[PDB]
Structure formats: C-alpha cells, structure tokens
Write an enzyme that holds these catalytic residues in place. Structure first.
Site, PDB file in Angstrom:
ATOM      1  CD1 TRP A  71      38.936  48.824  41.203  1.00 41.46           C
ATOM      2  CD2 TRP A  71      37.676  47.922  42.815  1.00 41.46           C
ATOM      3  NE1 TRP A  71      39.782  48.266  42.131  1.00 41.46           N
ATOM      4  CE2 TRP A  71      39.033  47.701  43.128  1.00 41.46           C
ATOM      5  CE3 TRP A  71      36.695  47.443  43.688  1.00 41.46           C
ATOM      6  CZ2 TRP A  71      39.432  47.018  44.275  1.00 41.46           C
ATOM      7  CZ3 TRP A  71      37.091  46.767  44.822  1.00 41.46           C
ATOM      8  CH2 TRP A  71      38.449  46.560  45.107  1.00 41.46           C
ATOM      9  CG  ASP A  72      40.756  53.212  42.189  1.00 39.62           C
ATOM     10  OD1 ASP A  72      40.726  51.959  42.171  1.00 39.62           O
ATOM     11  OD2 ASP A  72      41.817  53.870  42.125  1.00 39.62           O
ATOM     12  CD  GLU A  92      45.262  44.885  39.833  1.00 44.45           C
ATOM     13  OE1 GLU A  92      46.466  45.183  39.672  1.00 44.45           O
ATOM     14  OE2 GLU A  92      44.322  45.579  39.390  1.00 44.45           O
ATOM     15  CE  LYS A  94      48.720  45.586  43.059  1.00 43.20           C
ATOM     16  NZ  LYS A  94      48.292  45.983  41.688  1.00 43.20           N
ATOM     17  CD  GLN A  95      44.135  45.420  45.557  1.00 45.32           C
ATOM     18  OE1 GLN A  95      45.103  45.409  44.794  1.00 45.32           O
ATOM     19  NE2 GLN A  95      43.138  46.290  45.436  1.00 45.32           N
TER      20      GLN A  95
END
Ligand SMILES: O=P(O)(O)O[C@@H]1O[C@H](CO)[C@@H](O)[C@H](O)[C@H]1O
Ligand SMILES: [Mg+2]
Length: 775
Positions: free
Chosen positions: A339-340, A477, A597-598
C-alpha cells in the site's frame, strides 16, 4: 545542491546503504550503485533488477516448505577484473587509498573515483555508470584506467551469472538461487528463473580506442571478454561497456532483441540520452526551496530523482509493474508491492500523470487474483493482498515459526485489508487530478465495484442498525488481535471504516455523474440494486467509537488497553521505535497496550484532510468537538513511537494545520533526511525508502505548500515557515500547467490555461499566462 556525494570508505550496512541511494534506474531496471570491481561481500553488493521479474523459491524449515517470491537479482553485467604483468589487481579496503562515489541528479550519471595501491605504483580508476531512459533496455559503463608506471594490463569484462539474492541478511536462511544459466554465446548470457519460467538475457560488448576485446571461454556461468594493452606512464585508458537487458516477461523474443540492441547503440548514446532526459525533466519537476537548512535542497531533489527512477512512462507504458516499497534499489521485502503506492501515486498524478496510469494498470490487471484471494479466505468480491507480486495472490506469509518454542503459528500480516481502499483511493486521486475517465472505464470502476463487494459483504449489521467490520488490522502493525484470543484481527478500525465510508461516497457519486459507464460495469459485475442499496446503508451506518472528549478510538475497545511508560522504556533501552520488539522480549504483548507504530486513525487526514474526514464522521451520525483534530493528534502522538519512516510526516502535515510550525519542520527534517544521514547505520542497506520520499514531498507541497488538487478543484492555502524564504514548483491539473512561487507571506500563481481556483478559500479566476499574487 544537485549531486549526492560520498567521500571515504564505508563498511557493512553503511556501505550497502550508500549503494542503495546511488542506484540508477529508469522504470525498467534498478541498478545498485556498487563498484564495478567488486562482488557480493561484507562491504559490497552489486544489484540489477527488472520490473516484475520475480522467482519463487522453496525452502524447507521445520518440516514445512516456505515459498518466497523473490525479486530476482540479475547476473551482474558490470564486473571488471584487472591484471598487471599477469599478477591480479587486488581492489579491497586495504589497497584503496582514495574513494569518492556519487550520482549527479542533473544528468543521472553515477561516478566512482578510486585510487588503488598496486605493487608497482598507484592505479587511478574512474567509473561512469548510466542508464538510458529512452532505449530503456540499455546500460553503459565508462571506465578510465591510469597508472603512474608501465606494465602489461589485461582487462576482464564479465557478466557474472553465479550470484544469488543476498542483499537482505535475514533472507539468507532461505534458498537464494534464483535462476539457471542456460547458455553463454559470444556477447550474450541467458538464464531462466527456476520456477516462474522467465527467460533472462544479459548481453554486453566492451570496446576502447586503443585495444580490442575478445570473448573468451570463462569460468562456469560467467561470460568473459578480455583485452590487453600496454599502460604508458600517466596515460589514461578508456573502456566502454554497452549492456542490453531483456526478459521474456516483457519481450516475446528477448534473445534476438538483445542482439540487435548491442549492435544499434553505444555508451555515448546512453550517456547523452540520460543527460538530455533529466535536463528536460528538471524544467518542471524541480522543487526549489531556499531555507536555513543547507542540506534540505539536495534531499528534495534526491526524493524527486529516486521516485522517477522507480517508474517513468517511457518505459513503464510497456510494463506490467508498480512501485515497490524500495522501488528497484534493493531486496528489502523482496520487491513486493505494498500500500506504499499511496505515497507516490498522487505525486505521479500531479506531475507526470501517464506514469501514474501505468502503475495503476498493475492493480487493475490483478482484480481477478484479488477475487481469487477473497474466495481463498472465505470472502467475496475483490480482496487485494497485503503483499502483491507477479500474479497478485497474497505474498505475505500466512504462517510463521515461533522462535522460543519450535512450533508454527498463524501469521496475521495479511489482515491489513485496508490496502484495498488505498488502490481505490489512488484511482480516485488520479481521476480527480487528471480527469482521465478512461482508466475507470478500463477496469478502474470494476476494481471499485468488486472491492466494494468485499467490504459490503464482510460488513455485519447489529440489532440497532450499525454496521461493523471485524477481523482486520489497521496501519498500526503493533496490534494484530484483541487480548486473550488467538483469532487475528480487531473490530471497527477507525481508519478502515472512514476510508470505506469515503469509497461508498465516491461510488454513489459515480452512479450519478457517470451513469452510462456505471450501469455497464455494474451489469458486467452483477452489482445490482441489492448491492447498491447495501452501499447506501453502509455509507450511513458504519460504526465508530468516540469518547465523550472527542477521541476517535483506533478500533473498538482500544480505550480498555493498558498504558506504556514511554519515558521509562526510553531511559532503560534507549530507542523505543521498536518498542513492540522490546515488549515481546519482556514476555509482553503489544496487543495489550496503547502504542502506535505509525499513523492509524490520523492516516485518514493524510489521505483526505481534516475537513473531509470531519464530513465523513458527521455523515455517519457522530458529533465531534470543534477542536477534535488537536485533541486526536495530541492523544495519538503521545502513544506513537514512529516504528516506520512514514509516521512522522503525517504528524508534520497535521502540525501545519494546527500552526505548530516548529514541530512541523522538525518532523519533516527528521523524516526526509533518514536515508541520507543514516546516523543509526545501514537503514537503506536493503533498499531506499520510496514511500517516505513521496511522503515528505507531500509535506512540502501539499501541507506547508498548501496545494490540494483531489477535491474537484485546485485549492491554494499556503502556510510557510519563517525559515522558508522561497518555495517554487509546478503542478499538473487536467492538462493545465500551474507554477507557484511562495514566501512566508505571499503566494504567486500562474496557469498556462484558464482556470477557476480557490486561494485561502476565496474563489479566483486565472487567465492564461497571467500570474496573480496573494499576500
Ligand atoms: O516494518 P517497517 O519496514 O519498519 O515498515 C513497514 O513497511 C511496509 C512496507 O514498506 C509498510 O507497508 C508498513 O506500513 C510499515 O509499517
Ligand atoms: Mg566455461
């Protein structure tokens, strides 16, 4: 300013990392910036990759066969071995006396200037590497040898077909042999991938003014050309090697193609082709920022460079491929597509739209596999994989080996189903910015309708009418399941329900504004009134959990999890950006704690902006306080350790909206310089981080620069930091070029066609080639 340069010998992952950022590419090949004199060892890794050329290996571990799809490192066509008076020239770290390598972003040329100490004096070696972006199968090398003495020099020009995939250290446990060398004939080596039936043809010719090279019989699986010359004192010898790459994945007859290519090109042509290409590219692609950061202007162009090497329409129009997480610079994550894409697709759409269309074809071509993937997991419609490769089946592992006890365990990595919504989001952005509805007609609408079927069918209506999406993972994640169970996936991830709410809105708009196309595709996909009725009610009844204070819970039940003492973990362990692995080393599960994580919930703001997301929450029948953005940003930044390079720039863009200029420039400087500085050491050893390169450019142009194109109109609301004295760049919107010059207190905009735009929310009419200034 224009040249990424390194001086001095590095070792280990630091040496690999320079090689990654010095990689040259043209959409079709990725050619790692390694020295022409070295093979894979502890300080060197030559790498050559082709778009979409993967191989599947089978490695048995613990009585189970592990299948890995590997992006293939081709046979190394750049290897050079030297010899003086029949004595080999040893070129290692103990004999190299001066070393500098770098890539000139103005012409796309790699240089390496070496000096080697030999028993008879000093050898000066300067290498020029280039790739042709027009004849995109062509590579070329300029080698200059000079000695302060005289001896017999024999040059061996090799295509090394004995190498393996060895870039990623943790992947070496698996079978790393990717092809068999089927033939060596004159200038040409031919290989065939062991499991994917791809013919790989590597051909080369080596020439010079003052010597002749002849193909000779060489070691097993190596093609060898040899030339001999008498070195005169301080007399430079110049050697050209023309390389032609071709595979049966993109060519019907790759052998004869390489043959004709070697006979119809030269190193000079490649050099001038790369030269003219980038000079033309920089007329519009440059992003000029004069600021108090002396290194900032270089990394902005380094971002633009590597994103355009990863994909460019002149090559990618002929290819069935998209941009991997590392582009084509290394083997990190085996070249799979993530998905980057969301981090580069809007850039391609805004400055080079045809390339964006090329790589969106990769996903459209693989709707069928996604439909097959949905059935495999007991789902409906098109469910796109977390890791896609050759065929579009799920290439993340379903099962992982426990390391404490030696038993297999479920792997939850594929449950980040929201990747389907990124693909749909990327087609919307492209359609919005370009106006090219021919992509929606040629699969884009079918992709949306089939993925919508996956979401609508997976939804579950409760007794009070709310719809829920369970068994999924968000972008964070660190959270794969609820505490207590082995069943993977959490419920009602806020990022997923919101992005899905958006996709139904855009679907429903298409049924009105594109009725002819819609009814045609809906008939072909069995998207009848039942599905459309479900879409309307799901667009209104998707559930979110928001606390009385206005905090949108990452997913249902997130508020019940435990807190982490971040300051204690930081002082005890140092860095906490891998706090998940720190927690697991203590026998603790990140499933139990409030740590991100993000960006997860806040990732909706990166995709759509805060105004759009607020409209979606209200559309779902939820009331937010007027300062929900700052509250939610504060809440989640306090729990986010930035385990990914893409974390900080989402907060940076939000900080611009909040007018937190100090933190915004801080987080952006941190993220954009991650690969360049490498203070930790070797973070790009397995590939450049393409997503953060596109993400930081988004912060510069769309947040700080305040340019939006996706909302049906051009919106201009710049908010520059005081230290940014000038920010200039161009943009493409539905065939019209736009130029911008911005200072901390004024914006100037010019369109080469008539355009109605908005400046700080105020309607503005642009006349062709007549600029306006707004202070
Ligand atoms: O585990 P890392 O490499 O740190 O970050 C991961 O990399 C993935 C591919 O780049 C990306 O899709 C994930 O969002 C990200 O968490
Ligand atoms: Mg032989």
């Amino acid at each position: 300013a224009w040249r990424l340069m390194y001086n001095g010998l590095e070792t280990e992952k630091r040496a690999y990392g320079q090689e990654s950022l010095l990689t040259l590419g043209n959409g079709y090949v990725g050619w790692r910036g390694a020295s022409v004199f070295q093979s894979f060892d502890e300080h060197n890794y030559p790498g050559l990759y082709v778009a979409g050329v993967f191989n599947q290996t089978r490695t048995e571990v613990a009585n189970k066969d592990v299948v890995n799809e590997d992006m293939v490192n081709l046979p190394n066509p750049q290897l050079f071995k030297l010899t003086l008076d029949d004595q080999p020239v040893v070129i290692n770290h103990d004999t190299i006396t001066h070393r500098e390598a770098g890539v000139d972003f103005q012409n796309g040329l790699f240089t390496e200037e070496l000096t080697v100490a030999v028993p008879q004096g000093q050898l000066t070696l300067r290498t020029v590497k280039a790739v042709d972006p027009k004849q995109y199968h062509m590579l070329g090398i300029q080698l200059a040898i000079t000695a302060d003495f005289s001896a017999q020099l024999q040059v061996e020009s090799i295509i090394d077909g004995t190498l393996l995939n060895q870039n990623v250290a943790r992947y070496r446990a698996f079978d790393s042999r990717e092809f068999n060398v089927t033939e060596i004939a004159g200038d040409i080596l031919t290989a065939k991938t062991r499991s994917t039936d791809i013919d790989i043809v590597v051909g080369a010719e080596t020439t010079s003014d003052v010597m002749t090279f002849q193909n000779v019989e060489g070691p097993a699986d190596m093609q060898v050309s040899t030339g001999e010359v008498t070195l005169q004192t301080n007399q430079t010898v110049q050697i050209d090697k023309l390389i032609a790459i071709g595979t049966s994945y993109e060519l019907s007859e790759p052998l004869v193609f390489v043959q004709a290519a070697l006979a119809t090109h030269s190193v000079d042509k490649v050099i001038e082709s790369s030269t003219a290409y980038w000079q033309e590219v920089w007329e519009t692609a440059d992003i000029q920022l004069d600021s108090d950061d002396p290194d900032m202007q270089l990394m902005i162009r380094m971002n633009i460079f590597h994103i355009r090497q990863a994909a460019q329409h002149e090559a990618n129009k002929d290819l069935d491929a998209s941009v991997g997480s590392r582009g084509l610079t290394g083997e990190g994550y085996r070249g799979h597509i993530f998905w980057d894409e969301i981090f580069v697709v809007p850039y391609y759409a805004a400055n080079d739209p045809e390339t964006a269309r090329d790589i969106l074809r990769y996903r459209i071509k693989r709707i069928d596999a996604a439909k097959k993937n949905a059935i495999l997991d007991g789902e409906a419609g098109a469910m796109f994989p977390w890791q896609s490769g050759m065929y579009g089946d799920e290439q993340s592992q379903f099962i992982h080996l426990n390391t404490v006890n030696n038993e297999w365990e479920p792997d939850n990595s594929r449950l980040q189903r929201h990747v389907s919504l990124t693909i749909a989001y990327n087609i919307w952005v492209y359609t919005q910015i370009t106006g090219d509805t021919s992509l929606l007609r040629e699969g884009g609408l079918e992709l949306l309708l089939e993925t919508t079927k996956f979401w609508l069918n997976k939804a579950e209506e409760d007794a009070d009418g709310r719809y829920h999406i369970a068994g999924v993972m968000g972008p964070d994640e660190y959270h794969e399941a609820y505490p207590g169970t082995e069943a993977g996936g959490i419920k009602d991830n806020a990022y997923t329900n919101l992005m899905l709410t958006w996709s139904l809105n855009w679907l429903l708009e298409l049924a009105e504004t594109q009725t002819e196309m819609f009814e045609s595709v809906a008939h072909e996909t069995d998207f009848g009134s039942d599905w459309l009725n479900l879409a309307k009610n799901v667009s209104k009844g998707l559930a979110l959990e928001i606390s009385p204070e206005g905090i949108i819970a990452q997913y249902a039940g997130y508020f019940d999890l435990e807190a982490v003492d971040f300051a204690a973990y930081e002082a005890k362990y140092g860095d906490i950006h891998r706090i998940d692995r720190l927690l697991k080393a203590e026998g603790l599960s990140p499933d139990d704690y409030q740590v991100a994580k993000q960006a997860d919930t806040l990732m909706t703001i990166y995709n759509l902006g805060n105004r759009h997301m607020a409209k979606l929450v209200a559309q779902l029948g939820y009331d937010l306080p007027e300062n929900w953005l700052a509250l939610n940003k504060d809440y989640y930044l306090a729990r986010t350790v930035h385990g990914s390079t893409t974390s900080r720039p989402v907060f940076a863009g939000i900080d611009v909206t909040l007018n937190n200029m100090d933190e915004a420039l801080d987080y952006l400087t941190t993220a954009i310089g991650s690969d360049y500085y490498d203070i930790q050491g070797g973070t790009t050893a397995e590939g450049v981080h393409i997503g953060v390169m596109g993400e930081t450019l988004e912060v510069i142009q769309n947040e700080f620069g305040g340019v939006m194109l996706r909302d049906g109109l051009v919106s201009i609301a710049p908010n520059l930091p005081t230290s940014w004295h000038r920010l200039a760049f161009t943009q493409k919107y539905r065939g019209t070029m736009l130029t911008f010059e911005m200072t901390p207190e004024a914006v100037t905009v010019m369109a080469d066609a008539p355009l109605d735009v908005e400046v700080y929310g105020q309607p503005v009419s642009l006349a062709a080639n007549t600029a306006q200034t707004f202070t």
